[PDB]
Structures are given as C-alpha cells and as structure tokens.
Swiss-Prot record, chain A:
Subunit structure: Component of the mitochondrial small ribosomal subunit (mt-SSU). Mature yeast 74S mitochondrial ribosomes consist of a small (37S) and a large (54S) subunit. The 37S small subunit contains a 15S ribosomal RNA (15S mt-rRNA) and 34 different proteins. The 54S large subunit contains a 21S rRNA (21S mt-rRNA) and 46 different proteins.
Protein name: Small ribosomal subunit protein mS23
UniProt entry tagged with the keyword Chloroplast: no
One Gene Ontology term of the molecular function aspect: structural constituent of ribosome
UniProtKB/Swiss-Prot annotation, chain B:
Database matches in Pfam families: Ribosomal_S8
GO cellular component terms, semicolon-separated: mitochondrial inner membrane; mitochondrial small ribosomal subunit; mitochondrion
Name of the protein in its database record: Small ribosomal subunit protein uS8m
Organism per entry: Saccharomyces cerevisiae (strain ATCC 204508 / S288c) (Baker's yeast)
Subcellular localization, as worded in the UniProt entry: Mitochondrion
Description of how the protein assembles with itself and partners: Component of the mitochondrial small ribosomal subunit (mt-SSU). Mature yeast 74S mitochondrial ribosomes consist of a small (37S) and a large (54S) subunit. The 37S small subunit contains a 15S ribosomal RNA (15S mt-rRNA) and 34 different proteins. The 54S large subunit contains a 21S rRNA (21S mt-rRNA) and 46 different proteins.
Keyword Mitochondrion: yes
PANTHER family associated with the record: 40S RIBOSOMAL PROTEIN S15A
Disulfide bonds: none
Keywords: Mitochondrion, Ribonucleoprotein, Ribosomal protein
Function text: Component of the mitochondrial ribosome (mitoribosome), a dedicated translation machinery responsible for the synthesis of mitochondrial genome-encoded proteins, including at least some of the essential transmembrane subunits of the mitochondrial respiratory chain. The mitoribosomes are attached to the mitochondrial inner membrane and translation products are cotranslationally integrated into the membrane.
Single GO BP term: mitochondrial translation
Taxonomic path: Eukaryota, Fungi, Dikarya, Ascomycota, Saccharomycotina
UniProtKB/Swiss-Prot annotation, chain C:
Full protein: residues contained: 160 to 234 of 318
Residue ranges that the Swiss-Prot or TrEMBL entry lists as coiled coil: none
Location in the cell: Mitochondrion
Function according to Swiss-Prot or TrEMBL: Component of the mitochondrial ribosome (mitoribosome), a dedicated translation machinery responsible for the synthesis of mitochondrial genome-encoded proteins, including at least some of the essential transmembrane subunits of the mitochondrial respiratory chain. The mitoribosomes are attached to the mitochondrial inner membrane and translation products are cotranslationally integrated into the membrane.
Subunit structure: Component of the mitochondrial small ribosomal subunit (mt-SSU). Mature yeast 74S mitochondrial ribosomes consist of a small (37S) and a large (54S) subunit. The 37S small subunit contains a 15S ribosomal RNA (15S mt-rRNA) and 34 different proteins. The 54S large subunit contains a 21S rRNA (21S mt-rRNA) and 46 different proteins.
Name assigned to this protein: Small ribosomal subunit protein mS26
Additional facts recorded: Present with 2010 molecules/cell in log phase SD medium.
Membership in a protein family: Belongs to the mitochondrion-specific ribosomal protein mS26 family.
Gene: PET123
Swiss-Prot record, chain E:
Domain of life, source organism: Eukaryota
Other comments on record: Present with 2810 molecules/cell in log phase SD medium.
Name of the protein in question: Small ribosomal subunit protein uS17m
Its biological purpose: Component of the mitochondrial ribosome (mitoribosome), a dedicated translation machinery responsible for the synthesis of mitochondrial genome-encoded proteins, including at least some of the essential transmembrane subunits of the mitochondrial respiratory chain. The mitoribosomes are attached to the mitochondrial inner membrane and translation products are cotranslationally integrated into the membrane. uS17m may have a meiosis-specific role as it accumulates during the middle stage of sporulation.
Family: Belongs to the universal ribosomal protein uS17 family.
Compartments where found: Mitochondrion
Stretch of the intact protein here: 179 to 232 of 237
Species, as recorded: Saccharomyces cerevisiae (strain ATCC 204508 / S288c) (Baker's yeast)
Gene: MRPS17
Assembly, per entry: Component of the mitochondrial small ribosomal subunit (mt-SSU). Mature yeast 74S mitochondrial ribosomes consist of a small (37S) and a large (54S) subunit. The 37S small subunit contains a 15S ribosomal RNA (15S mt-rRNA) and 34 different proteins. The 54S large subunit contains a 21S rRNA (21S mt-rRNA) and 46 different proteins.
RNA sequence: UUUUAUAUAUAUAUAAUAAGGAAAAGUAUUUAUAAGAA
RNA sequence: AUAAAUAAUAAAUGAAAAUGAAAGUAUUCCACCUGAAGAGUACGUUAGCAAUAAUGAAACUCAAAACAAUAGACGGUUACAG
C-alpha cells in the first residue's frame, strides 16, 4: 500500500470544513488532536549497529589500515570486488539478533534430552521484578532449569572465575547435577514417608497410563476385528 | 563532470524520495559534492556526510587514489508534513543537448520567459548553473554576471 | 568546494605500493611452482608401477591374467 | 475539498499532471488575466474561486477525466509557498522569486 | 622482498610515533616532513 | 537494553529446535520441549507464545517449532506425553557416574531421565521392598517384548510362557501382567534398555 | 579548555593561536566538543554564517564529529539571535529525525526562539500569535517529561516564559513573574548570606535585580493595548497556567522586603501603566532603596553644587591641557554614575524600552519628562566643559555645576536614542520635536563619539535617520520635502522601495504621476 | 571519547577517569501567456 | 551470507489487460509508425538457375477503422446438483 495521507491529516480537513463554514461545531477530538500532533513521517531508517552482539554495520577497512600481510601472506593493495559494492540494504535490513546463550542452550538440551520433558512456562510473570545474584544457581521466584546453568556459566565467565566457556559450563553442570539429585531424593523420601505414615493414594502414574492404554486398546480391538471381517470378504 | 552521472544521481534521489529512505549514497566527486552542497544550502537535504561504500565514515578519512574508488557522499533526505521535501530532480542541459546561457537569457528565464524551450523558473524551484567549474544557483550566477551552463531543476 | 578532492600519492608511497604488489605476484607464483613440484614428487613416487618397457608389460600382464590374482568382479 | 490558491486568485505554479490519459498543463497568470482553459476547467475554476489561469489539455479530452484530473491536480500537484519554506527551513523571503528588469 | 617491506614500514611507524625523533632523523640526513621521512627511510634501505 | 532482556526472555530460553513434530521413526528420548500454561491463561488462550492458540485445544501442554509462519499458523502439537514417561520411570524406582567429577554433543549419562543413585532400597509398611513390581503389557508373540509404564523392554521369562499367551495370540496386549524390573541400562544413542521378568 | 576561556573573553587572536598551535605542533584537530566551542565563539561574536558553516562541517567530517544535542541547542540559540523560526523548527525536526534525544535546554531554546520571532509582524511573517502559542506548547511538552535538567535551565525557563509574556503584552503575567523571581531570589540570597543582612543590603539587592527581567517587564509595559487578549488565555492548559501564576502572585502580595507594585491584580488604564513603569524604574535605579539617588532635596542640591564646585575648580589647574582636564571629567562622571546608580540596570537597552513605553502609550508629556531627566546630549555637555574651563582657568556657573552633578542620572544620547525620539516625533506629529532632534543630530555628528564609529556604520545610521525624516514628512503631508530629501542624497544613500513605500502610496493616492516617476527612477535606476 | 593504572609478550587484555551553558529592546514594477467542439 | 533464474506482489506506470526489476524512475544510440482499403499491390531498379527476395508508390472510395474492458445473447461449451 501507498503511504496514506488522509488518515493523519484529519485535523487539516476538519479545520478547512470549519473555517469554510461547511461544519458549524468543532468535533470534540479537534482540540485534543491539535494538542497532540500525529506523527506524519513514515521513513525507512538506517541501522548501523546490531544491538544483540554490538557488531558495527556500515564500516569498511581501508587499504591503509593494513600495513601488514594477511593470513595468506598477501598485502592488501587495492580494494576487492566485494569492497566496491554499495551496502545500503545492509543498513536498511532489520538486524538479526544473536546471543551466546543460544549456542549453550542448544548444547544443554542435546546433552540432557530428558530435561526437555520437564514442562516450561513461557508466560513471563514480571521481567523487571527479577532480582538475582548468580553466585548460586537457585533463585527464589525461578525454577531450576538448564537456563539457570547457562546463566551461571555467563556469570562465571563475566567475573573471570574461569577462563574458557567449557570450564564454566562444566562447573555449572555439576552444580546442576548436585541440586537435581537433592530434589530427586526429596521426592523419593517424601513418597516413602507418606506411605510410612498411612497415606493412601487412589491412582499412580503407571496405573493411569495403563488405564488410558486400556481404553485405546479396547477401541483398537473393536476396529481391528471389524476391519478383519471387512477385509476377509 | 559527467552529466550522465548527475542524471543518475537525480534519478537516484527521486527513487529514494518515492520509497522514503532517510539516508542514501551518491558518487564522491567534485561535481556531485558541489551539487549536494547546493541542495543542502537550500534545505533540500538534511545532512552531508563522507563515507565508504558500506556507510558513513566513523572517523575522518583522508581521500587518496588508494580509496577514491570506495568513497561515497551520504545525503540525508527530508520528509515534512507527510511529503518529501525533495520531490522531483531533473536535468535541463542533457548530454545530447547541452544548454549554455548568457546572463541576460538567464535573467529572462528567471523572469517567466521561456528560453530555448526551458520552462521558466517556478516560485519554489531551484535551478543550478555551472560556471568555471563551480556550481551555484541561477540567482547567484546572475548576480555574479557569469554566463554558464544550465544544468538541473530541483522543485 | 574550491580545494583538491584528493591528496596525490607521493612517489615514495607509490614505490612502496609497487613493491608490495610485486611481492604479492612473486609469492603467488612461488606457491604455484612449489605445488607443481609437490605433484611431480608424488608422481615420481608412483612412477614405478607405470609401464614404459616391454619387460614390465609382460610381467604385469602375466600377473593380472596368468596369475589368479584378485579380480574386480562385482558381486 | 479545499484547494491551495495563490493570492486567492490563481495556482501557485505551473502544474504538469497526468490522469488516465489526460495531460493537464496549467500555468498561473497575472492579475486581470482571465480563465483561458478547457470549458470543463473553466467551470471548475469558477466554482473553486480561481480567477486567473492558462492551460492546455493533451491526449484524452474526456470531460469527466478532465474534471477529476483538474481536482486531483489542484490537490496533489500543488504546494503553498509557506509549505515549501517550512519544509526547507527557510523564510518566505528566501523562496520568493527575485524581480529582474 | 618481504623483509625489506616490513622493515621499511616498521621504521616509518617508529619514527612517526616520536615526532622529535623524526626531526632528528631529517636533520642528520641533512606533511612535507612525512614525505621527506619516507624518502630518507627508503633510501636508507 | 531491549536486546539483553530479549536474550533473557523465556521465549529465548527455549532452545532452537526444528525437528519434525510428527515423527514416525524410533523414539528414544524427548525431542521437543514441553510448554505448559496455567488454567487461567488457558482460559484466555495465552501460552506465552507470539499468538493465541486456538480455543479448540483443551490440553495444557504442547510442543512447538515456529512462533509464526508464512501460513499465519503456529506450528505446534497438543502433546505433553513424554514427561509422564519420565515421571513413570520415577515410580518404577529402578536406578540407572558422569554426574560426578571442544563442546561434545553426546548424551551425558542419563540425560535427565533419572538422577537417582543405585545404592538405596524402598521401605514399605509390609517391610523392605526386595524387588520392585510394576504392571505392563506383553506386546507380541515372538525375546518377548513388553510395554511397561511408557518404555518398551525385553522380558526375561521363567520356564515356559503362560498358556494364556498361546491361547490369545495377537490379542495378547489386551491383558495386563505384572513384571519385576531386573535391570535398567542406558545405551549410547539414548535408548533405555530394561530387562524385566514376568512373574 | 583553552577555547572555552578564549570564548569567555572573546579573544579572536587567542582562539586562532591555540588552534594553529595544536594543529602544527601536536597533530590535534578539533573534535566534536572543540568544534562546538568554536560554534559558541562564532555565536558570541555575532558570526552566524561561520557558525553555520562549522555546523555543516561537524555533520560532514565523520559520525564522531556529528553534532549532538548540545550543538543543536547552540544552533537554536543562533536562530534565536537571528529570529529565524523556520530554521529552529527544521532543526527540531532534524533532531527528531536523527534519533538525537532532546533535553530541557532544547525546549526552552525553541520557546525563546519563537518568542523572539513573534516580536513584530515583519520578522514573524504575520504569524506572531501562532508563534507565541507554539512556544507555550514547547514549554508544555517540556512539562510533560523530565528530560535532562541543568542548574541554569530553571533560570532560563522563567526568562522564556517572561519573553512569551513580554511579547504578548501580558502585563498581568509579566508583573506576576517579575515579582515571583525577585521575591524568590531575595529570599534565597538572604537565607544563604554569611554577612549580616542589614550591612550587605546593597550587594544582595544588586545581585537580585537582573537587568534582563526588568527589560522584559518594561517591554511588556510598552506593548500595552487595552483591547489585546492574551494568547495564553485560549488554551485550557494556558488559562490554568495563568490562574496558577496570578494566584501565587496575589497570595504572595497579600502575605521583610516590599516592591512598589500597585495593590491591583491587573492594570486597565494607561495612567496606571505609566505609574508602575516609573515606580519599578525608580525602584531598580535605587538598588531596592539602598541607594537614595532618585530622592532629592534642595539642601542636597546646594551641598552637591558646593562640593562639585570645589572639586572642579581645584581640578582646573592640574591638567596639562584642556584635553587632559576633559579626560579627568570623563573619568569623574563615569565613576560617579556607577557609584550612584547600578551600571547593569541603567544602560542603553533598558532606557530604550523605558522611553518606548510612553510612545506606544501615546503620552508625550511623560516621554519628554523621561527623556530630559534620564538623557544628556553630548554636544551640550562638551560645551559646558568648555564654559567651565573658561570660567575657572581665567547664576549660569551654578547651573553648569548642577549639570555636571546631574550627569549621574543621565545617559549619552546615541544614534539609536535620537532615532527613537524621531519615532516619537512621527507618532505625535510634533514638528518642533523633529526640528529639535534634527538640530541635535547635526550637532552630535560633530562630537567625538559619532566620529569614533566606522564610516559604514555612520552611513547606515545617517540613512536610517534620513528614512525616518522622509516618513515624518510623508505623514505630515509634505511630500515635496520627502522627495527633496530623497533626491538630495541619492548617491550617498541607497534608497529602496521598502523605505519609500509609504511615499509612493501617498503620491499615488493624489495621482502625482511626475513625482511618482521621479521617485521610482531614483529607487529603481540600479 | 581521551588519558592513565595493573598484568602479559613497541604491542595486547582488563579497571578508572568526560573538558563542549550562550541569556537583552529597537534597528509595488513579479513580468510571457498556448481553451476546444461533433 | 553473496549472486542469478522463477513465481506472486508494494510503489510507479498504463486506455486497460497487465508490467514489475521492466511496460518503473533517468541517460545514450539505433530501427520503425502517422486513418481503413487500394497494398506489400503495380511500375521501375538490384540479386538469384528459377520459385522469387529487397526497395516500393500513386490515383480512386469512405467516415470510417482498431485496441482493452463491461453487460448480455449464443456455442455441434465444461462441471456440479436437483
Ligand atoms: Mg503502451
Ligand atoms: Mg515481391
């Protein structure tokens, strides 16, 4: 669609109507819209910096900036073909946002596929209210998940307690293992205590799965016997 | 001094105004730089910047034969009241037909009289003239009593 | 507007640039020739199997056909 | 719709407009200079309040298309000098045409 | 060739770093100063 | 800044996954993260994703690939099955150490299925649980395989198959049996090989 | 820092020397901050073209050199000095376009630019009321959001408001704001003064009385028109703002230190306006009453005449020549006027507004009283010096002594004040005033202060005077005299149609085609 | 940004530090002129 | 990620169909057109073994002639239902 003129100039048309005498009474919105001018510029704006990683867009390194040879052993003496092409599209494209965590996360759920099965809630609660110190993995108001491992890894690297990504990742992983072992032991011991003290449970996960399997299998029984009868003829 | 390049720049500025880009790049030459400066003085362009083919110069770069091929002049366009300030940009003196006017004919052209099939100067328009390898507005060239080549119209 | 657009390259700068360009050319020529020599050495290492004399031809023919060597027959 | 009018009598400048095969070339005119245009354009100018105009119509001469093109040219092919001056960040004296004798 | 180029460049950079050392170099040899330094440094090598 | 918050946003927390949602190959471990929504947000079709999930969906769990697509649909599936299998493993009690002291993509030990330690036994009001018993279903007339609590295992028999097997034939899966999980091990590819005995 | 101090002292040689030194000997070229300081230098020197060129270069050279909000505020100040509001609005739109974040100074500068532009119909392009309304809107936009405040900005804000009040002729608002500023300033300074209040009244009051605020209040008085309706009354936000300011002014008055404002919310008549102008002027002259210069007595008159007779008839002998004695008298009068009356408040600009008040109010008697009492003609003063020289070296004598004594109340009548009195003659249609003014102007041409100025400035001022005389004779109907003036000085003065438009209209109304042709040939021969 | 610190091999990685604030009133001649209809 | 091909488009252009990186915004050069029919016809000339190919009119007659799209009718036009 073309940039539309009529939507934002309603005040001007109404002013013409009023001054000409075509309209006698000012609309209630007239004074408000006059006090608050609509934004009447619709321009594609250049972007020179990628916020996610800080890469600077629109920079060319001149020949003079290299007084030494490159990896192949060649001095840069003249611009090459790619350097001699105007890159306005690079300025006007929306920059792709890339984060380091996105890699480690992909590693973590590759290393621990069953951690994916633990349900996640994407409803944000309140982002601004987060007050976390990442010297320790467990945070109040937060679950214990792989993202905690990546956050602890980034905290470790930021403080330079460890140097390489792998080392901090491994340390956070081992803290994660300890904490999850503790939680598993709490769950097992709690169930054992409940059975120790007379608690009676109507249904368990195995029996629930067996029940659902039984319904599905009964329907499948009916359908298979009917289909065998149909196919025989 | 290529009039072909000035025509290409004019078409580029028109196309940029149509799609409403806030910044654009043109070739870095003396004629183009003077033309852009004249447009900027009249208020048709928001800003002039020197840069590479990739973008404006982050730090000041001296111009030498080493980097001349990759140099560009970045102009910021203006869009006011939902309308482009620089709407149409055309050539008067074309490469096939080049028009060099004496001063009196230039006054006549400014005074509503058509000269050599050039439409007379319009009120909110700017006509640029080249005299002694210097680009100026028609009014200045008349005030300087300089006979010159009548290049382009910016309305 | 009334000043030079560019700063002319000094003769000394041009000499340095020419030396750099000549070094680049000679370097690429050098890697080309050394790669060619490496291919020549690799071909020398296998030149023994290649038959250029009648005796080697008789020997290899007898080996492949008269001798019951492993044959490239697709199963 | 309201149309720009220079001195409440004429168009601000020359208008070269295209409408569905109708080419309108409308030139402003001095005070006292009558309306010298197509009859459709004459009636439209009479109703609009434009007193001084010259112009010529090329290619299609359909009256309906001439009328619609005339209205649309008055609306989009025209800009007040105040608008030009404000857009270019200049005073009205800087955009006025200088007199040459 | 590579040694010559690198030595020329490093000496130019070193002398350009200390401006007074550049003037001493010029006087012992006996933006204009930039070109004179370049000429003298290459003539040295 | 906005970029930092987007990096730490829960939508960003979900790793990039693009595997086929509908997969008919062998399934050894979860391949998509399960997204859970509270009942209150389900009432308003809010799942924390870019767009509202259709009101037809009544389950509170799904697995998704794309927040948005060219077809203006969210590429998802209303399935949250895998967690139950994991949870069902915790009911079995059979234990399965890399969890004790450049990037490698191998599944590290048990990849979150079970973090228990082998050396523990279950006390019950009857007494010490010597051997854990769970119900399952023998699947085919073949060793014999059984679907036990979300996992397929090979059952180790005790003398002869019960005659019920031979009488029923291919309808064997209809009837439940009680098995005792002899052992649980994890293969390199992530499969969980359990050996059980039909009592 | 070097350029900062050089701008503060406005030394071109120091600026040039420091820039050249750094470029030649240290390889340092000005960055964004130094270029901004250079722009402020050019602004201080009234050098707008060079400042705009420097701004263009700041954009041109690199993104690091690209202007930021500080430079844009400096350019807005330059536009305020030019009274160039289209450029101010364009620069605001450019600030928004380039994603630069405004500040409080930006909104205050825009408001001040619009207020200054709205002074006259010519500079405002006939949009004065709309420009004042737009400035008030910019102040409201500032009110909406915090932005970045500066310690000085608050002061600036109030000036802007008074500007919008002063150019609107809003005497109620101008009075209220002036009283608020003076009251708060005196209270704050008295609260935080180490010295005892009673002893240091002179210093505190001198610091309190900002000359610009008084000048704006006098400008508000001068633009009085009873039929005028304030532009700020139309808006609901504006009327609420007016209500707030007026209510606070009234409450503060009802509730130490006192000011001579009449006990009335607003002035509805010319006589009250004259009374308050005189009252505030005298209050400012007396440094809040600390100096009793304006209050005079015949006893004080006799004693001052006696003392100054002693001083001058003693001085007469010491000097080597008349020139040295005259120089001594110059130093004496210059030091005396500063001692007796505040130098900052009492100057050419404030006196110009003070005398412009009655001209707009159409009261000749008060204008002439103020002119005689507060202004001295240089040629008369030098004649008195020669007369006293003759008297001492070898009832009129005491009159000359009283003249020298009264110089402490008076400012020299420069060319601008002569032009103002000529404007008063045009407005009042007084032939006698015009004749006296042209005689005094001719005598002043001989005096040294006029010949001190450049030839081009002298020609410009003489041409302005000639145009004023032409306008006077045009209003009086003596078109023959106007054309005689125009023809007599065609070569030395460039006559344009703007100056002779009234003459041409008057001649066309009576259809004197010959005179019209002669005048048009004079103007348009070019 | 700039400058400097510690550390490491003239250079590199981290930490700190930022000089761009000015206020004042008043000072026409515009041009030449292109119409379509069945 | 960089290019080109393809498809659908935005703006723009167009009588519209539609074009869509050209049928867009501009520059340069070349070829071609000036109502239908007479007519690519006649005559002449050039080339070919020839068939023919190139170049190419005029008189006379008329207010016609054509393009896109619209709504109908019609089709020995399709499919779907009843
Ligand atoms: Mg066509
Ligand atoms: Mg033929």
């Amino acid at each position: 669609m073309k940039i539309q003129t009529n939507a934002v100039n309603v005040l001007q048309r109404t002013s013409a109507y009023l001054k000409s005498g075509l309209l006698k009474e000012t609309p209630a919105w007239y004074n408000v819209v006059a006090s608050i001018p609509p934004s009447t510029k619709f321009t594609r704006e250049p972007r020179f910096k990628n916020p996610s990683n800080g890469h600077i867009i629109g920079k060319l390194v001149d020949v003079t900036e290299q007084p030494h040879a490159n990896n192949k052993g060649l001095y840069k003496t003249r611009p090459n073909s790619s350097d001699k092409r105007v890159g306005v599209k690079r300025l006007y494209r929306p920059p792709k946002l890339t984060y380091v965590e996105d890699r480690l996360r992909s590693l973590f759920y590759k290393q621990h596929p069953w951690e994916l099965s633990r349900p996640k809630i994407l409803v944000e609660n309140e982002i601004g209210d987060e007050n976390y110190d990442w010297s320790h993995m467990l945070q109040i108001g937060r679950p214990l998940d792989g993202e905690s491992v990546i956050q602890r890894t980034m905290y470790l690297i930021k403080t330079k307690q460890y140097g390489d990504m792998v080392e901090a990742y491994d340390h956070a992983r081992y803290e994660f293992y300890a904490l999850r072992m503790q939680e598993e032991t709490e769950q097992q011991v709690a169930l054992e205590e409940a059975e120790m003290f007379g608690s009676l449970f109507g249904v368990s996960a195995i029996e629930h799965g067996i029940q659902k399997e039984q319904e599905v299998l009964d329907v499948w029984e009916k359908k298979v016997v009917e289909e065998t009868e149909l196919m025989a003829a | 001094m290529s009039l072909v390049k000035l025509a290409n720049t004019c078409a580029h500025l028109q196309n940029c105004s149509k799609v409403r880009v806030a910044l654009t790049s043109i070739p870095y030459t003396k004629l183009q730089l003077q033309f852009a400066y004249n447009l900027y003085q009249q208020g048709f362009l928001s800003s002039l910047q020197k840069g590479s083919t990739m973008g404006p110069d982050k730090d000041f770069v001296e111009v030498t034969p080493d980097n001349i091929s990759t140099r560009r002049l970045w102009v910021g366009l203006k869009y006011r009241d939902n309308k482009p300030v620089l709407s149409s940009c055309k050539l008067i003196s074309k490469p096939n037909s080049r028009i060099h006017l004496p001063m009196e004919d230039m006054k006549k052209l400014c005074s509503g009289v058509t000269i050599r099939n050039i439409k007379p100067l319009q009120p909110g328009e700017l006509i640029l003239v080249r005299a002694h390898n210097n680009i100026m507005d028609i009014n200045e060239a008349i005030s300087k009593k300089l006979d010159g080549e009548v290049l382009c119209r910016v309305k | 507007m009334s000043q030079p657009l560019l700063r002319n390259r000094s003769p000394e700068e041009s000499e340095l640039l020419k030396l750099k360009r000549n070094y680049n050319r000679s370097l690429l020529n050098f890697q080309a020739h050394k790669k060619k020599l490496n291919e020549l050495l690799n071909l020398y290492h296998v030149a023994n199997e290649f038959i250029v004399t009648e005796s080697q031809l008789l020997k290899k023919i007898d080996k492949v056909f008269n001798d019951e060597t492993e044959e490239f027959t697709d199963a | 719709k309201e149309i720009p009018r220079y001195e409440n009598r004429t168009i601000y400048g020359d208008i070269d407009f295209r409408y569905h095969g109708v080419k309108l070339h409308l030139r402003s005119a001095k005070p006292g200079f009558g309306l010298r245009v197509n009859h459709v354009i004459f009636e439209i100018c009479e109703c609009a309040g434009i007193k001084d105009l010259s112009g010529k119509v090329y290619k299609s001469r359909n009256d309906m298309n001439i009328a619609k093109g005339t209205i649309e040219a008055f609306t989009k092919a025209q800009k007040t000098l105040d608008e030009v001056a404000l857009g270019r960040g200049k005073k009205l004296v800087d955009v006025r045409k200088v007199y040459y004798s | 060739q590579r040694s010559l180029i690198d030595r020329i460049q490093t000496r130019l950079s070193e002398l350009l770093s200390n401006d007074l050392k550049c003037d001493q170099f010029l006087k012992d040899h006996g933006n204009i100063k930039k070109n004179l330094l370049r000429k003298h440094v290459m003539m040295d090598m | 800044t906005l970029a930092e918050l987007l990096g730490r946003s829960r939508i960003a927390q979900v790793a990039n996954n693009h595997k086929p949602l509908t997969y008919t190959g062998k399934k050894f471990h979860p391949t998509h993260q399960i997204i859970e929504t509270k009942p209150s947000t389900l009432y308003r079709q809010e799942w924390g994703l870019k767009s509202a999930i259709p009101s037809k969906i009544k389950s509170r769990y799904l697995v998704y690939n794309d927040l948005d697509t060219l077809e203006r649909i969210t590429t998802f599936e209303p399935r949250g099955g895998t967690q139950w299998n994991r949870l069902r493993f915790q009911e079995m009690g059979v234990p399965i150490n890399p969890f004790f002291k450049k990037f490698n993509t191998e599944i590290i030990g048990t990849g979150g299925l079970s973090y228990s330690l082998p050396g523990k036994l279950k006390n019950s009001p009857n007494g010490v649980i010597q051997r854990t018993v769970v119900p399952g279903r023998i699947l085919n007339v073949v060793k014999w395989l059984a679907a036990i609590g979300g996992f397929v295992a090979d059952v180790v028999f005790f003398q002869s198959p019960p005659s019920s097997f031979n009488s029923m034939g291919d309808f064997i899966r209809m009837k439940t049996f009680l098995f005792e999980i002899l052992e649980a091990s994890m293969e390199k590819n992530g499969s969980v090989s359990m050996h059980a005995r039909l009592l | 820092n070097c350029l900062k101090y050089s701008t503060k002292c406005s030394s071109f040689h120091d600026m040039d020397y420091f820039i050249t030194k750094f470029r030649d000997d240290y390889g340092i070229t000005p960055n964004k901050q130094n270029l901004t300081t250079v722009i402020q230098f050019y602004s201080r020197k009234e050098m707008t073209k060079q400042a705009w060129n420097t701004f263009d270069t700041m954009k041109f050279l690199s993104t690091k050199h690209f202007p930021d909000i500080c430079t844009y505020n400096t350019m807005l100040r330059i536009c305020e000095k030019e009274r160039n509001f289209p450029k101010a609005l364009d620069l605001f739109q450019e600030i928004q376009d380039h994603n630069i974040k405004p500040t409080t100074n930006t909104y205050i500068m825009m408001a001040r630019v619009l207020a200054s532009s709205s002074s006259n119909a010519v500079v405002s392009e006939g949009k004065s009321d709309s420009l004042r309304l737009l400035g008030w809107k910019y102040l409201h936009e500032l009110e909406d959001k915090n932005l970045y405040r500066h310690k000085k900005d608050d002061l600036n804000l109030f000036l802007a408001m008074m500007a919008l009040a002063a150019f609107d002729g809003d005497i109620e608002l101008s009075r209220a704001l002036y009283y608020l500023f003076i009251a708060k300033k005196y209270k704050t300074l008295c609260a935080n003064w180490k010295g005892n209040i009673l002893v240091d009244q002179d210093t505190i009051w001198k610091s309190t009385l900002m000359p610009e605020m008084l000048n704006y209040l006098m400008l508000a008085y001068a633009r009085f028109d009873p039929r005028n309706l304030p532009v700020l009354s139309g808006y609901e936000k504006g009327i609420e703002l007016r209500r707030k300011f007026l209510r606070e002014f009234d409450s503060s008055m009802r509730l130490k230190f006192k000011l001579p404002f009449l006990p009335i919310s607003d002035l509805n008549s010319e006589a009250q306006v004259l009374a308050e102008s005189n009252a505030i002027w005298s209050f400012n002259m007396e440094n809040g009453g600390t100096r009793n210069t304006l209050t005079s007595s015949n006893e004080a008159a006799l004693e001052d005449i006696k003392k100054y007779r002693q001083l001058l008839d003693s001085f007469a002998q010491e000097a080597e020549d008349f020139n040295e004695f005259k120089f001594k008298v110059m130093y004496e009068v210059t030091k005396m006027q500063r001692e007796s009356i505040n130098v900052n408040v009492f100057n050419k600009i404030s006196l110009h507004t003070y005398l412009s008040i009655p001209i707009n109010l159409k009261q000749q008697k008060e204008f002439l009283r103020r002119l005689t009492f507060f202004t001295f003609q240089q040629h008369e003063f030098e004649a008195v010096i020669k007369r006293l020289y003759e008297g001492y070296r070898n009832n009129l004598i005491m009159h000359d002594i009283w003249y020298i004594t009264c110089l402490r109340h008076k400012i020299m009548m420069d060319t601008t004040l002569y032009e103002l009195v000529m404007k008063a003659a045009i407005e009042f249609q007084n032939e006698d005033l015009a004749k006296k003014v042209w005689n005094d102007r001719g005598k002043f041409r001989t005096t040294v202060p006029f010949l001190k100025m450049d030839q081009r400035i002298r020609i410009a001022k003489d041409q302005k005077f000639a145009h004023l005389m032409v306008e006077f004779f045009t209003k009086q109907g003596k078109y023959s005299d106007a054309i005689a003036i125009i023809l007599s000085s065609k070569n030395r003065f460039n006559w344009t149609y703007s100056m002779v438009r009234n003459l041409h209209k008057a001649l066309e109304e009576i259809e004197d085609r010959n005179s019209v042709e002669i005048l048009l040939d004079v103007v348009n021969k070019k």
